[PDB]
Design a protein around this nucleic acid. Sequence first.
RNA 1: UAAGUCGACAAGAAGAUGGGCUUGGAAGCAGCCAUAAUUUAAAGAUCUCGUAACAGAGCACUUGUUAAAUCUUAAAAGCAU
Lengths: 98, 46, 201, 147, 124, 245
Amino acid sequence: MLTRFITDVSTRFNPFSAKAKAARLFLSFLPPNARSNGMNITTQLLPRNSTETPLLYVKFKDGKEMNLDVENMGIKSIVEEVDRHSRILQKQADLNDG
Amino acid sequence: MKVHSAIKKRCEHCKVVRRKANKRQNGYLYIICPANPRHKQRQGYR
Amino acid sequence: SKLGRTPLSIPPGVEITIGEPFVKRDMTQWKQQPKRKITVQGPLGQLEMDIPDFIKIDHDAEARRATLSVANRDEKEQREMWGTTWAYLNRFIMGVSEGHTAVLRLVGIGYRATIDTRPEKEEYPGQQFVCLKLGFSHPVEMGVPKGMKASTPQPTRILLEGINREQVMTFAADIRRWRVPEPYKGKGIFVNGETIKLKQK
Amino acid sequence: VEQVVKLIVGAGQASPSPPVGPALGSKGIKSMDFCKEFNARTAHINTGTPMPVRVTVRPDRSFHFDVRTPHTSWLLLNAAEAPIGKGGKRKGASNPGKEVVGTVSLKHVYEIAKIKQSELRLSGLPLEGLCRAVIYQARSIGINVIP
Amino acid sequence: AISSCPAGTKLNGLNYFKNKADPVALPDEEYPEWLWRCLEVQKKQRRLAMKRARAQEAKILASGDLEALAPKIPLQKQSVNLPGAVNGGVQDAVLADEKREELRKAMRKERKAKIKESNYLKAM
Amino acid sequence: RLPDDYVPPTQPPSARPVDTRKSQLLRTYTSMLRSTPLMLIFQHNNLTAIEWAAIRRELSLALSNVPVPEGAPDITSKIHLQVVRTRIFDVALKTVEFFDPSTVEPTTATTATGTKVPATYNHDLSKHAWKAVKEATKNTEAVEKTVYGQLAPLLVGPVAILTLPSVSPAHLGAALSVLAPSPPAFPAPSRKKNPGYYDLTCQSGLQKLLLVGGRIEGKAFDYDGIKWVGGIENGIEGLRAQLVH
RNA sequence: UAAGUCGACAAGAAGAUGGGCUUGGAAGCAGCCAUAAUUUAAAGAUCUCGUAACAGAGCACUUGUUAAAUCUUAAAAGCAU
Ligand SMILES: [Mg+2]
Ligand SMILES: [Mg+2]
Ligand SMILES: [Zn+2]
């Protein structure tokens, strides 16, 4: 996974809910230096009593704003759709580089 | 490429493969290495 | 094969059509093995392949998936073609929907590339010929195979496009065959971020 | 990427020189500027005392450094009353296995551990385990431990 | 009378500050207790051993109990449940957390040899 | 000499290899799930060594300012923010929940002398524990009703645990504000008195920690519920209030 | 070996401390001596590259993700290349 092109991600989920699994796994792949590099992140933890649908927000440095539901998609299904857009940005940069 | 009778891996990237084997010849055993091209070896003569 | 078990997600628009077991008669062979004609049609085009019959495809359309299976896992021939047939379908599905691309970077003083027509050597009407100035006395021209689209965003950058990956990468390897990257100055043709370690001197 | 360099300089001796000149003059930062700040940082230490430094050169050649306590080896030797060696400084045993420059008492260790605990990054480590960290270094510099 | 340096002894060269004097040795009682225990980590000629050591070797055995000479499995290979009890109390709880940290050192010590040896097999 | 049937007394037949760190680490957590009534489950996100050391440095400072003049045990250093193996730590809960050592039949055990001595295998690494856990886990919904089911979704990805020898509300407010502050209940330390807490590295570490949940007296607790427990000034004092009524 | 084997990927791989000596310089990594400790989910006074010397990139080692329900690794023997 590549987080270079990811600007900021906002996650709101309930930990006790088994559906929030992919939300937490995605949060781990982020490198250590993502914070100081300028990538804003805000994680909200929902109470155990009331359970709202998890929300996973993603946005790249090219205006693309991705929003994928966590209940339906698995962690393996989240990364591919993320790096997919991160793949075109790398080649587009090379095509424009030099 | 060094043609030896005893080909051996010389690092972690060396791989043993059998290439040039087809319906006419048996082929040779090779030691391919993408890191160091000096690790290239072959077993057997044409 | 840990890849053959993985279902193949059919994205919206892609349609898989599994033929029926057929045997094309051959006078030079006493027994031909049956195969299955699998068509993968979609927005960009249509690709077809002939797989062995022992590979079973349970095409379930309600969920838009298709898993592969063999009749005997202990056979070496069936284990190999199980993974290979899966990798090809994955490329076909992802080639007719999105498309495969290859970027060629021309490093060196005096290396250029242009995309224009050469009606004299056209194998088919309107064939595009990639012209390369690679320090040779003669001009290097190559016609893109039918089904590919070649563009040049910059003089030192080529962009190949097509639905068949094998055809795109095979053509990208033919252009690189004229100037292979050297380890002393990096001059050559690099494909898809390919690099080469240089000498300190 | 923000680079970092290790340096051992005197207490208030900061100037373009072998220790400071080439260590930082090659990156691009203002060496003279650093010596101006290091002097203010070290205005209460005996002139000439060695002081390790970890200067972090951020991009654009903007540096920020954090002075550190003297080396543990320099303290044990300075406190062991070991014989002065060639170079105007105490020298450790060439082969600690047999040679013995001195024998520091545990009473000194408890003081060498506190001065090394004044640092924030080392302020959490329990003091108990810190006395055994220097005792494990005494065996390497040919210093014995007397109860 | 346990310390070699008596109270009042001047610790040479332990103060690098200008406006200050070197530390002075304090009474031994004021010092913490663990200091007097931190030193717990410091660890024909054969014919003499043959007639003295190997002599005492045999008769010291006193092979009455077989388990006495058993392999004496280390602490890092046992399977007996550690001294942990539910709602047992703070005392047992604290004592229970002491063995978990003791087993830690047992495994830690074994990694050095396993890491050192593998490093030795690569620099033969 | 030692016979064949003889086995060491401190190494009974286990369900899997013992020398391996997989099983050796399970025995630790099982005893940790019994000796530690109060436990908080976190989730670390690629914390470096210097960052970990900074987070553990503040706890040593915040937990050292707790008033304990009642001659109570020296409970200021047995509190550790420990990283655990989520996979094996998950099996630990199953073991403590669905395994009753009193359901084992003792069997003869041959010593070095060859004599048969009755012995029972109750160690958590025994084939009975592994067997009881699997069969007990076969049920899908009955498991969700247990404490384990209420904590399995939390044991996903990397997790760190803060073990307290027992329930001490004063120690929670000192540890909950340094890892999950939430004013005005658990306000963060002041800058005019704790300049180390607001350090570039220490501040960059807490941002990667996320207090997921807790476990108290073998009972699941949410982040909101932990505040109520920590909100109590003291346990003994709370009981006195009820007596006045 | 579902207590997730095997492979890959993501991050970590600390601190006392540039161990002492040697040397123009020797900071884990020319050479010599020592290599009980400490704190950690783990981290050799250092296994392979790298620097004039640092830095830096890997390894041992550690956690996590993906993922096998006859599918891991090694040795011996038989027949072949
Ligand atoms: Mg060197
Ligand atoms: Mg050295
Ligand atoms: Zn090689």
